[PDB]
Amino acid sequence: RHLKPFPPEFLWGAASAAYQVEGAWNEDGKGLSVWDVFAKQPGRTFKGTNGDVAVDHYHRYQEDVALMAEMGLKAYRFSVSWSRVFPDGNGAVNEKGLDFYDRLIEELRNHGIEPIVTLYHWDVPQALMDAYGAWESRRIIDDFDRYAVTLFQRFGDRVKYWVTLNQQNIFISFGYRLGLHPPGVKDMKRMYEANHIANLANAKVIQSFRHYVPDGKIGPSFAYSPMYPYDSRPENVLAFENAEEFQNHWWMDVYAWGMYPQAAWNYLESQGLEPTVAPGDWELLQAAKPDFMGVNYYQTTTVEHNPPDGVGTSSGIPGLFKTVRNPHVDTTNWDWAIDPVGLRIGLRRIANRYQLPILITENGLGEFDTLEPGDIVNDDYRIDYLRRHVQEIQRAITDGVDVLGYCAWSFTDLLSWLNGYQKRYGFVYVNRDDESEKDLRRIKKKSFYWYQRVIETNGAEL
Amino acid sequence: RHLKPFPPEFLWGAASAAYQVEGAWNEDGKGLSVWDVFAKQPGRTFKGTNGDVAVDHYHRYQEDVALMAEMGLKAYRFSVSWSRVFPDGNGAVNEKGLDFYDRLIEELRNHGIEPIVTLYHWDVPQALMDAYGAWESRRIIDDFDRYAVTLFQRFGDRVKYWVTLNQQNIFISFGYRLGLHPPGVKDMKRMYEANHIANLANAKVIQSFRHYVPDGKIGPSFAYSPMYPYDSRPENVLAFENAEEFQNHWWMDVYAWGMYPQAAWNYLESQGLEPTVAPGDWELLQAAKPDFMGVNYYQTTTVEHNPPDGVGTSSGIPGLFKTVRNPHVDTTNWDWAIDPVGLRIGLRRIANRYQLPILITENGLGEFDTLEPGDIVNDDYRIDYLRRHVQEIQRAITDGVDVLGYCAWSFTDLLSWLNGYQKRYGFVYVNRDDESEKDLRRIKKKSFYWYQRVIETNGAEL
């Protein structure tokens, strides 16, 4: 057993999200997104940081793409801001907004970089929330489809790889169960209704894609934390079965097969939480097969048995499972797990269950970076993290998983949703902080040159 | 939470296998099976025990069925001895052989017991082995199909439930990898070829069944030991992924989906062990969907990481996994785990992966029963084992698994393949041992009356 090489056209990539990078929040006719409004609620974000300017990629995209070309990136995954294209969500298309993405795509294409367009990264126009509650209304299905079709028509000739909803499980759960993200709701019944509507929207746009981009490849991207049982106690293995189905299959089985898993469905039904199903829903969900599963990966989760009066720090569902710290994985300086083998396990699970190729749409290390004199940022810790994950991807490929590419999170430093700028993810440091924009200058970190060498050798030198 | 009741037509059953019970090995024109010949090789079986007489069910079937009716069995699962029906495997049908099964089916029906006919329990006629190597030749596909169709034509009007191959993973692995069962070969390449041919034979007969028994239900039965990781060490979870796929999905994915899992396939191909595929193979395997998955269950298996220089007591595959004792389950007197929750886990896994109904075709406890004065057998240990498993089945039904029935192994004591008679499995003790058949009298054990009560109450007291 020697390791297989990465395939010749492997998409070595890096990624961002529109609200986190663009700025220009009110320029060129752009409408308000739910995040523009949410982040301006006092106390919501660290030091009141928000996306008004972010790292100003909207104005600095030429420099950023030039840096991507210097690195030799094979692919750049970005999201399109719906509120730039339809400021009111529906209604009139904004040609200024589409023209930004056209210029970005042209810059990428002129440097030989594959664009990977992500339709949705959490920024539905505020006008749709006001009009009908956004993801809680079936009205969004057609509005999202009209938006996606517009993008397919404008860019399908130049963009082969598309992601639909990015981390639906996050925007739905954080928005409707934990109340951390818009709309700030804590209501499981509403969460599962909005989730079902998002599932229908995903399926509808994949159907549209088959018409407008017949040679393209499309898929949703799932924030995947593979579950582990704590030990071989039967009750803990059963907790693992419950958790993997409830947290992971609940989304990925719908994406791949168009069907919710039955044990989870029956539990939700027993709680009065299962979504409302309309005639035609199952037919639509089953008729929208993706070309790949997108995977956003940071860590695994370990679970154990949870008595019916137990946990609802540990989280879980009474009678089904609760989380427990895994003593067998490392942690970051923020006490989150580092588990590169877990990425191999997740890739293996997706191939084994769904036989789908996988695009890793997000993986990276957030850490304080120190800017040293001479514009030097020594981030060996980020190189170590990325190296270990890429090594495990190579082992998954050797096992037989079809991995289409790997998008490191992120290309440049970016604004986090709630925590400001100090925990940085980029290959490229952006000189700004939570207090001021400074000069917004871009500074290549050591990891930039490391990844440049990874790409040059197609992953042979890590 | 309220447990669901066992469904109104739940098949409370018990089971046997032809070679293990019938005797009459050379009567009424029956041809030699591979087991008739194999068990007579010196040293092959304990004390030279063999199936010449076994417990003489061929002559005593009326008494045995009368005991089943006294117990109130809803179903009796038995296997048909191919060599009674086609003494040479192909060629001329033997009407006396069919007449035995006709009389057995009529006896069951007259007592209100549902027959569950198992086509194949390891006893291919020796003439097919002599002519072409039995399961190593594609010739067996049509010969097995002709045998199955004969049974469908004669009995399809009276038998709704059919099992095709019973525990293919055992007869193939023991016959061609471990050399413990006929033909006594130890050659992994030959094992995987014979296994592929058995897969095609299974699919072919299910296809034929659709033509001849339009209201029937058919499926294969898999000897399922669900795998557990030892703990939440990533390498042990990975070992579990490898083990569940290689040991379990390798068979059940072919049965349910008509496809071998890719990581296991690629491992075999790297060893030069993958089977030879002919045009039409995938089409046939994919077009023969079963109505249920049959499950033979005794215990789970716990696994841990196994370096490429490791185990090949513990067993495993270097670089994939190795077994390890599970400290969290009880054990039988033969180091078998007792893990009723593991049965719930296995049922949940089959429902979650394949959405198939499940017929539990075999589950039971083997122990050295003592015949006490007054013809009393106090087998409280067997009652305890069965009770715990039936309770876990009810929990699986409550979770949403469609369990069609439960066949306790076995109805009467029977001959084991290699280990004689002393480790007994029956509800009904048979007075014989390894040295002689004694008088073969049938004696109800305490567990007989326990299960009688379970059936009478439809499980409602457990």
Give residue limits of the domains in chain A.
Answer: 1-462
- Which pair of tokens denotes residue A141? 């299905």
Question: Taking a C-beta distance cutoff of 8 angstroms, is the pair A199, A193 a contact?
Answer: no
Residue type present at position A191: M
Q: CA angle, corner A134, sides to A129 and A135, nearest 5?
A: 150
| Beta strands per DSSP E along A3-107 | 11-15, 75-79
Measured distance CA(B228)–CA(A234) in Å, rounded: 8
Instruction: Supply B216's token pair.
Output: 């029937």
Share in percent of chain A as helix, strand, coil (round to 5): 40, 15, 40
HSE-CB of B307 using CA atoms within 13 angstroms: 2
Are A278 and A137 in contact by the 8 Å Cβ rule? The answer is no
Cα A347–chain centre separation: 16
Distance CA A220, CA A289 (A): 10
Q: Which amino acid is at A155?
A: F
Method: X-ray
Q: Are B237 and A345 inside 8 Å of each other by CB?
A: yes
B230/B218 Cα distance (integer angstroms)? 35
Mutation test of the interface with chain B: which of A232, A297, A341, choosing the one with the most B Cβ atoms within 10 A? A232
Structure token digits, residue A72: 């030799």
Q: Token digits for A341?
A: 């083998």
With 0-12 CB in 10 A as exposed, 13-18 as middle and 19+ as buried, what is A283? exposed
Question: What letter would DSSP give residue A290?
Answer: -
* Closest listed residue to residue B208, CA positions, set B141, B283, B132, B120: B141
Given CB atoms, is A249 within the 8 Å cutoff of chain B?
Answer: yes
Distance, in Å, from the CA atom of A302 to the CA atom of B411, rounded to the nearest integer, reads 42
Using a CB–CB cutoff of 8 Å, tell me whether B274 touches chain A.
no
Q: How many helices (H) and strands (E) does chain B have?
A: 16, 16
Cα–Cα dist B370/B376, whole Å: 8
Q: How many angstroms is the resolution?
A: 1.2
Between CA B353 and CA A241 the distance in angstroms is: 11
AA identity, residue A215: D
Tell me the nearest-neighbour CA distance from B331 into chain A, angstroms: 14
Which residues have a Cβ under 8 Å from the Cβ of A412 and sit 6 or more positions away? A16, A21, A55, A57, A64, A67, A426, A427, A428, A429, A430, A442
Record the tokens describing residue B270, joined without a space: 């790297």
Sort A421 into a burial class: Cβ within 10 Å, 0-12 / 13-18 / 19+. buried
Distances from the Cα of B47 to the Cαs of B40, B50, B438, in angstroms? 11, 9, 16
Q: After which residues is chain A broken (C to N over 2.5 A)?
A: 312
Contact B172, B181 (CB under 8 A): no
In angstroms, the CA A137 to CA A177 distance is: 17
Identify all chain A residues contacting B320, using CB atoms and an 8 Å cutoff.
none
Q: Are B300 and B342 in contact (CB under 8 A)?
A: yes
* Cα–Cα dist B431/B422, whole Å: 11
* Closest C-alpha to A209, from A267, A275, A160: A160
Cβ contact B228–A229 (<8 Å): yes
- Asked if residue A100 lies in contact with residue A25, where contact means CB atoms within 8 angstroms, the answer is no
How does strand A75-79 pair with strand A114-120?
parallel
Instruction: Give the type of residue at A383.
Output: I
DSSP A88: B
- Residue from B30, B348, B17 nearest B163 by CA: B17
- What is the Cβ-side half-sphere exposure of residue B393, based on CA atoms within 13 angstroms? 31
Q: Please name the residue ranges forming H helices in B177-323.
A: 188-212, 234-243, 250-257, 262-270, 281-286
Contacts of A329 (CB under 8 A, 6+ apart): A299, A300, A337, A338, A339, A342, B234
Tokens standing for residue B433: 């041992």
Of B78, B85, B88, the C-alpha closest to B34 is B88
| Helices and strands counted in chain A (H then E) | 16, 16
Q: What is the DSSP letter of A72?
A: T
* AA letter at A158: R
Name the residue among A231, A232, A249 with its Cβ closest to that of B352.
Answer: A249
User: How far apart are the C-alpha atoms of B410 and B405, rounded to whole Å?
Assistant: 15
Closest CA to A264 of A239, A234, A243: A243
Decide if A361 contacts A15 (C-beta within 8 A). Answer: yes
Locate tokens 């209201």: which residue? B215
Q: Six-digit token pair at B348?
A: 């949940």
Q: Which of B16, B30, B99, B29 has the alpha carbon at shortest distance from B65?
A: B16
The DSSP-derived string for A424-458 is B--SEEES--SS--TT--EEE-HHHHHHHHHHHTT
Q: Are B205 and B144 within 8 A, CB to CB?
A: yes
d(CA B127, CA B145): 16
Contact A238 B341 (CB under 8 A): yes
Place of tokens 């695994």: A300
State how far the alpha carbon of A159 is from the alpha carbons of A78, A212, A357, in Å.
12, 12, 18
The CA distance from A200 to A208, in Å, is 12
Q: Residue B222: which of B166, B261, B150 has the closest Cα? A: B166
Q: Do B241 and A327 touch (CB under 8 A)?
A: no
Burial class (CB in 10 A: 0-12, 13-18, 19+), B374: exposed
- Among B300, B304, B381, smallest CA distance to B348 is for B300
> Which of B332, B331, B312 has its CA nearest to residue B321?
B312
* Structure-token pair, residue B47: 């004390």
Are the C-beta atoms of A429 and A384 separated by less than 8 Å? no
Closest CA–CA distance from residue A240 to any residue of chain B (Å): 10
**Calpha distance B302→B239 (Å, rounded):** 10
Cβ of B3 under 8 Å from any chain A Cβ?
Answer: no
Partners of A372 in beta bridges: A376
Q: How far apart are CA A145 and CA B265, in angstroms?
A: 40
List the beta bridge partners of residue B14: B76, B408
In whole angstroms, what is the distance from residue A68 CA to residue A104 CA?
A: 12
- B273, with CB counted inside 10 A (0-12, 13-18, 19+), is middle
B251: which 2 tokens?
A: 């068979």
CATH architecture of B1-462: Alpha-Beta Barrel (3.20)
Q: Do the Cβ atoms of B322 and B311 come closer than 8 Å?
A: yes
Q: Kindly report the CA angle at B85 between B81 and B89, in degrees rounded to 5? A: 85
Phi, psi of B328 (to 5 degrees): -110, 15
For B295, the enclosing helix (H) or strand (E) is strand B293-296
Q: Cα-atom radius of gyration of chain A, to the nearest Å? A: 21
How far, in whole angstroms, is CA A94 from its chain's centroid? 25
> How far is Cα A171 from Cα A144, in angstroms, rounded to an integer?
16
Tokens of A48: 């009141």
Measured in whole angstroms, how far is the alpha carbon of residue B145 from the centre of its chain?
20
Q: How far apart are CA A186 and CA A176, in angstroms?
A: 5
DSSP at B456: H
Angle among Cα A119, A123, A128 to the nearest 5 degrees reads: 105
Q: Are B164 and B218 in contact (CB under 8 A)?
A: yes
Of B365, B372, B373, which Cα lies nearest the Cα of B426? B365
Identify the helix (H) or strand (E) that includes residue A166: strand A161-166
As beta bridge partners, residue B214 has: none
Residue A348 contacts B, CB cutoff 8 Å? yes
Size of chain A in residues: 462
Q: Tell me which residue of A428, A435, A400 sits closest to A414, measured CA to CA.
A: A428
The structure tokens listed for A206 are 């994949």
B325 shares contact with chain A (CB less than 8 Å): no
Contacts of B229 in chain A (CB under 8 A): 228-229, 232
For chain B, how many residues are written?
462
Q: Phi and psi dihedrals of A428, rounded to 5?
A: -115, 115
Give me the phi and psi of B410, to 5 degrees please.
-135, 175
Give yes or no for A382 touching B (CB within 8 A): no
Q: Which residues pair with A77 in a beta bridge?
A: A15, A116
The answer to whether A360 and A297 are in contact (CB under 8 A) is yes
How far, in Å, CA of A108 to CA of A128, rounded? Answer: 31
CB of B384 less than 8 A from some CB of A? no
β pairing state of B428-430 and A227-229:
unpaired
Q: Across the strands, what pairs with A330?
A: A338
Distance CA A54, CA A49 (A): 8
**What CA–CA distance (Å, rounded) separates B298 from A260?**
30
The string of DSSP letters for A349-412 reads HHHHHH---EEEEEE---B----BTTTB---HHHHHHHHHHHHHHHHHHHHT--EEEEEEE-SB
Contact in structure between A290 and A206 (CB atoms under 8 Å) = yes
Q: Which two tokens stand for residue A421?
A: 């700028």
Query: Cβ neighbours of residue B316 under 8 Å, at least 6 residues apart?
Result: B243, B303, B306, B310, B322, B323
